[PDB]
A paper describes a structure:
Vibrio bacteria require iron for growth and survival. They utilize a ferric ion‐binding protein (FbpA) to bind and transport Fe3+ into the cell. Most gram‐negative bacteria contain the highly conserved FbpA protein, which is considered bacterial transferrin and binds to free Fe3+. Therefore, FbpA can bind Fe3+ in the periplasm of gram‐negative bacteria and transport it intracellularly through a transmembrane channel while consuming ATP during transport (Lu et al. 2019). FbpA from Vibrio metschnikovii (Vm) is a potential target for inhibiting its growth.
Diffraction‐quality crystals of RA‐treated VmFbpA were obtained with a reservoir composition of 1 M (NH4)2HPO4 and 0.1 M imidazole‐HCl (pH 8.0). However, in the crystal structure, only a partial electron density of RA was observed at the Fe3+‐binding site. The RPC results indicated that the binding with VmFbpA was a degradation product of RA, DSS. Therefore, despite RA and VmFbpA being used for co‐crystallization, only the degradation product of RA was observed. Compared with Fe3+‐bound VmFbpA, DSS‐bound VmFbpA underwent a 2.1° rotation in its N‐lobe; however, compared with apo VmFbpA, the protein did not undergo any significant conformational changes. In the ligand binding region, DSS bound to VmFbpA through hydrophobic interactions and hydrogen bonds. Gln58, Asn138, and Asn193 directly interacted with DSS through hydrogen bonding, including the O10 of DSS–Nε2 of Gln58, O of H2O (443)–Oε1 of Gln58, O of H2O (443)–O10 of DSS, O13 of DSS–Nδ2 of Asn138, and O13 of DSS–Nδ2 of Asn193. Interestingly, Arg199 did not directly interact with DSS, but instead, interacted with one hydroxyl group (O14) of DSS through a H2O (444). O of H2O (444) formed hydrogen bonds with both Nη2 of Arg199 and O14 of DSS, thereby stabilizing the binding of DSS to VmFbpA. When DSS binds, DSS sterically clashes with the Asn193 in the apo conformation, forcing it into a new conformation.
Residue numbers in the entry: 1 to 309
The structure:
């Protein structure tokens, strides 16, 4: 037996996972690698003619476009019903294999957890002027802004963006350079995806940055996801589902958190010490329909209007 996977996830991440799945299941996985968003475009072009059985992406916006297009199979309840609601389609059209959340990183030399305000909205204050770094070209930042729009509307969101721009940010290419800049003393705070700082702490246990959450439910704690789904057009849904269940298995989940530095979606995983307990993330996370992150173009418009792009 074989299935076809369209992977928005990189081969160096995916390959060991699919190889162990193949070894255990006897099912071969033929993978087309690509950009998360561009593979969702391809799937919409292929429609019912797609050869794909499984789609695995690393941004909820693209998955949402597939869900809205009617291209995803409803998963068995046995796959999704036990997962936290931040990690599943309500109607069972996809599940998170791992959590890719927004956090706030801070200098351990020049700041502390006490400096972190209740809301991401509070970073426009003078207390933070010139002390934070933004990466407005980062996909994680952008989907976070889309989530802020969904939760709070454009006017609040644009006001925040402008106030953040008026607060003298330093502008960086990506999360790695933002975190390095904390180490280097250029900035004391950065809005980042959760899985970069683990990489620094693994290469150097005493890297002088930690990361943490805003208050419970704040949009700054958004949990994006590396979502996986079965195509409605698949004629091999049992095999596709076995693949998904493999990725939710303890060995795969432990790998995602220890090696990839993303949050697990299940209990019983030894936590990455940089991330801490899954229970804390569940308390921190905002309630957001991730399928609503599909509106990237509206977000890029607001960022252009704020002068951040
Ligand atoms: O494929 C990748 O680049 C990474 O696994 C995921 C990633 C991390 C941080 C980002 O800002 C991003 O856009 C993607």
């Amino acid at each position: 037996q074989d299935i076809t996977l369209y992977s928005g996830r990189g081969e160096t991440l995916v390959k060991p996972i699919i190889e162990q799945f193949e070894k255990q299941s006897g099912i071969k996985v033929n993978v087309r690698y690509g950009d998360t968003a561009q593979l969702a475009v391809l799937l919409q072009e292929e429609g019912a003619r797609s050869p794909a059985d499984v789609y695995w992406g690393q941004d909820a916006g693209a998955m949402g476009a597939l869900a809205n297009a009617g291209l995803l199979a409803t998963l068995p309840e046995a796959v999704y019903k036990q997962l936290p609601e931040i990690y599943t389609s309500k109607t069972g059209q996809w599940v998170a294999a791992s959590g890719r959340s927004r956090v706030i990183a801070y200098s351990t030399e020049r700041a502390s957890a006490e400096d972190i305000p209740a809301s991401v909205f509070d970073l426009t204050s003078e207390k933070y002027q010139g002390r934070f770094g933004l990466a407005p070209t980062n996909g994680g930042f952008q989907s976070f802004v889309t989530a802020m729009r969904v939760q709070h509307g454009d006017e609040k969101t644009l006001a925040w963006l402008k106030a953040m721009k008026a607060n003298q940010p330093k502008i960086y290419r990506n999360n790695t350079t933002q975190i390095q800049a904390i180490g280097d003393g250029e900035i004391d705070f950065a809005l980042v995806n959760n899985y970069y700082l683990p990489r620094f702490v693994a290469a150097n246990a005493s890297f002088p940055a930690k990361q943490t959450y805003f208050a419970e439910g704040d949009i700054g704690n958004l949990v994006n996801v590396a979502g996986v789904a079965v195509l409605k057009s698949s004629k091999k849904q049992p095999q596709a589902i076995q693949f998904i269940e493999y990725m939710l298995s303890p060995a795969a989940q432990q790998y995602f958190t220890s090696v990839v530095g993303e949050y697990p979606v299940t209990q019983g995983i030894i936590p990455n010490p940089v991330l801490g307990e899954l229970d804390t993330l569940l308390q921190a996370a905002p309630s957001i329909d991730l399928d609503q992150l599909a509106d990237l173009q509206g977000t890029l418009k607001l960022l252009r209007d704020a002068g951040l792009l």
